[PDB]
Amino acid sequence: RRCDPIRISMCQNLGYNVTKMPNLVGHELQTDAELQLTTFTPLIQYGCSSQLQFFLCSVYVPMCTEKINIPIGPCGGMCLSVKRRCEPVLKEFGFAWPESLNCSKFPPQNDHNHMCMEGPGDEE
Amino acid sequence: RRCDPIRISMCQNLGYNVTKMPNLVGHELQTDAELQLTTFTPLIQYGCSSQLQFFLCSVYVPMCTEKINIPIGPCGGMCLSVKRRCEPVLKEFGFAWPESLNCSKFPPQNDHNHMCMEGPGDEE
Amino acid sequence: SDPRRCMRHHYVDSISHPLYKCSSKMVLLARCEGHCSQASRSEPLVSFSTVLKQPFRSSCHCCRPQTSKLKALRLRCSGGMRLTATYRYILSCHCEECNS
Amino acid sequence: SDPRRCMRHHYVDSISHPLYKCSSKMVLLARCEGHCSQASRSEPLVSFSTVLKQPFRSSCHCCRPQTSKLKALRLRCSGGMRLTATYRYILSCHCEECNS
Ligand SMILES: O=S(=O)(O)OC[C@H]1O[C@@](COS(=O)(=O)O)(O[C@H]2O[C@H](COS(=O)(=O)O)[C@@H](OS(=O)(=O)O)[C@H](OS(=O)(=O)O)[C@H]2OS(=O)(=O)O)[C@@H](OS(=O)(=O)O)[C@@H]1OS(=O)(=O)O
Ligand SMILES: O=S(=O)(O)OC[C@H]1O[C@@](COS(=O)(=O)O)(O[C@H]2O[C@H](COS(=O)(=O)O)[C@@H](OS(=O)(=O)O)[C@H](OS(=O)(=O)O)[C@H]2OS(=O)(=O)O)[C@@H](OS(=O)(=O)O)[C@@H]1OS(=O)(=O)O
Ligand SMILES: *[C@@H]1O[C@H](CO)[C@@H](O)[C@H](O)[C@H]1NC(C)=O
Ligand SMILES: *[C@@H]1O[C@H](CO)[C@@H](O)[C@H](O)[C@H]1NC(C)=O
Ligand SMILES: *[C@H]1O[C@H](CO)[C@@H](O)[C@H](O)[C@H]1NC(C)=O
Ligand SMILES: *[C@H]1O[C@H](CO)[C@@H](O)[C@H](O)[C@H]1NC(C)=O
C-alpha cells in the first residue's frame, strides 16, 4: 500500500521489494533516477567495487517499508568502502565525486536510532 | 559403448540411463516395444498402481550396464505388489494378465546371485 | 542476477520480549534465501562391522549466512526492569553444506 | 516427470574390502539425487541471555532416502579369511529437512 515497487530493472532483484519517491537526492520519479544511474553504467562494468551498484540503488531508490514512514538507505562505512575503490577511477573520466554521494550524510551504522543497510565492505 | 540409450519418452527419466535390445519379451527394437506399452497407456491413467509404469518399462526396456553383459529387470515382489492391484482391472477390458508378465520368471530378490530392481511395494 | 539465487534479503521487524511486557523497538534485519544450484544426494555405505550406522553419505548445499555481525540493544520493561537483547545482522549469504 | 526432481537412481558397483585383499562381488544399488523444490533459508534469532548461541533458524530440504532395506553379503579373503559386508538398498527417495 504505502510503499511502491521498484521499476528500474538495474536496481531490481536486490535485497528489498519496494521504495518510495521522492528520492534522497530529491528525484521525483523513478524514470528520472533511472536516467542518472545509466550514467554510472560504464563505471559499474569496470567493477571498481562489487558492491557499487547496490550502493547506488540504495541511494537512488531507497528501501521503503510499511512498518514506518521513513526511508532506508546505506550506512557510510559501506559507501566509503565503495568510495575509495571508485573515487579515483571517477577522477579518470575527469570526474569529481558528486556531493549527492557525500558520505557524511549517511548514518554511521545500523541501529534502533538509525536504520541503514550495510555490506561486507565496512568503515567507521 | 555397450549399452544403448532409452528412446521411448514414456520410459525416459526413470532410475537408469540405458538399456539393451533385444527385449526380455524378445522385442527386437525399441520402437516395437514402444508400440506394446502404448496399449497399457489407458491402464496407467486409471492408476491401479503408482509403480505400474516403472515396472513395465523395467520389463520392456530392461536396465543395462557396461559393468556386465547381462540385463537387469524387476524383482517379483514388485510385480506382484503391482500384479494384484491391476490383475483385476485388466480383467475389466476383458483382459487376461499376459504370460509375458508372468511373475514366476523374475527373480525373488536382489542379490549378488541375481540382480533385479525393487520398489516400496514388495512380496516374497 | 537470478531472483532464485541464494541471497540476502532485507526487512524490518520489532523486537519485543516474549514473556515480559515491554516497549518494542523497531530495527532492520537481513535474512538468507534462495535455491542453491548444486544438486543434493545421498548414497549407501559399506560396513564390515557387525554394527552399521554409517547408513549413507550425502551432500546438500543449503543457503546460509557467510558473514554476520553481532548486535544488541536494551529494552525498558514495565516497572524497574530494563533489558538487553542480542542478535546477528547478516552481511553476506552463501551456499554451504548442510553438515559442516 | 522432471529429471531435476529428487529421485532414486540405479547403478551397479562392486564391493571389495578396502584394506584386506579379497574377491569382489558385483551388486546393484540405488542412490538419491535431484533438486528439492522448496527454497532454503535462515533468519536471525534473539536472546536475552548474556550467552547467545542461537544464531539463526534455517530450513533446507535435502533429498534423502525415504525407505531403505538393509542387505549384506559375505566375502572370501585370501588365506582363510571370509568376510561379511552390510549396506542399504534404497527403495524410496524424498525431500526432508536437513536437521531432523
Ligand atoms: O536507547 S536510546 O536509543 O533511546 O538512547 C538513549 C536513551 O535511552 C537511554 C535509556 O532508555 S532506553 O535506552 O530506551 O532503555 O539511554 C540508554 O539508551 C542508549 C541507546 O542504546 S540502547 O541500545 O537503546 O540501550 C544507550 O547508549 S548505548 O548503549 O548505545 O551506548 C544509553 O547508554 S549511554 O547513553 O550510551 O551511556 C542507555 O543508557 S542510559 O539511559 O543512557 O544510561 C536514555 O539515556 S540517555 O542516553 O542518558 O539519554 C536515553 O533517553 S530515552 O528516553 O531512552 O530516549
Ligand atoms: O555366496 S554364493 O552366492 O557363491 O553362494 C553359495 C556359494 O558361496 C558359498 C561360500 O563361498 S562364498 O559365499 O563365495 O564366500 O556359500 C556361501 O554363500 C552363499 C551365498 O550367500 S553369500 O552372500 O554369498 O554369503 C551363502 O548363502 S546365504 O548366506 O545367502 O544363506 C552360503 O550359506 S548357505 O549356503 O545359505 O548355508 C554361504 O556359506 S556356505 O559356503 O554355503 O557354507 C559356497 O557354499 S555352498 O552354498 O555350500 O555351495 C557356495 O559356492 S561358491 O563356490 O561360493 O559359489
Ligand atoms: C560533505 O559535506 C560535509 C558536511 O555537509 C562536509 O563536512 C564535507 O566537506 C563535504 N565533503 C566531504 C565529506 O568529502
Ligand atoms: C507362469 O509360468 C509358471 C512357470 O513357467 C507356471 O508355474 C505358472 O502356471 C504360470 N502362471 C502363473 C505364475 O500365474
Ligand atoms: C515481496 O517480495 C519480498 C521478497 O521477494 C517478500 O518479503 C514480500 O512478502 C513480497 N510481498 C508480499 C506482499 O508478500
Ligand atoms: C547418464 O546419466 C546418469 C544419470 O542421469 C549418470 O549416472 C551417467 O553418468 C550418465 N552418463 C555418463 C556418461 O556420465
Numbering used by the authors:
A (entry chain B), B (entry chain B): 43 to 166
C (entry chain A), D (entry chain A): 34 to 133
Paper text:
We purified Norrin–Fz4CRD complex and determined the crystal structures of methylated Norrin–Fz4CRD (dimethylated surface-exposed lysine residues) and Norrin–Fz4CRD–SOS (complex bound with heparin mimic sucrose octasulfate, SOS) at 2.3 Å and 3.0 Å resolution, respectively. These two complex structures show different stoichiometries: a 2:1 complex for the methylated Norrin–Fz4CRD and a 2:2:2 stoichiometry for the Norrin–Fz4CRD–SOS complex, the architecture of which resembles a butterfly. Thus although the methylated Norrin–Fz4CRD structure usefully provides high-resolution information for the ligand–receptor interface, the Norrin–Fz4CRD–SOS structure defines the overall architecture of the native complex. The Norrin–Fz4CRD binding interface is conserved between the complex structures. Each Fz4CRD interacts one-to-one with a separate Norrin chain, burying on average 1680 Å2 of surface area. At the ligand–receptor interface two β-hairpins in Norrin (β1-β2 and β5-β6) contact three loops in Fz4CRD (I, II, and III). Interactions with SOS involve the positively charged residues of Lys58, Arg107, Arg109, and Arg115 on Norrin, plus His154 and Asn155 on Fz4CRD loop III. We have discovered a GAG binding site that may span Norrin and Fz4CRD. We propose that the extended GAG binding site may allow co-receptor HSPGs to recruit secreted Norrin for interaction with Fz4CRD and to co-localize Norrin and Fz4 receptor, similar to the role of HSPGs in Wnt signalling. Secondly, we show the Norrin dimer binds separately to two molecules of Fz4CRD, in contrast to the 1:1 complex of Wnt8–Fz8CRD.
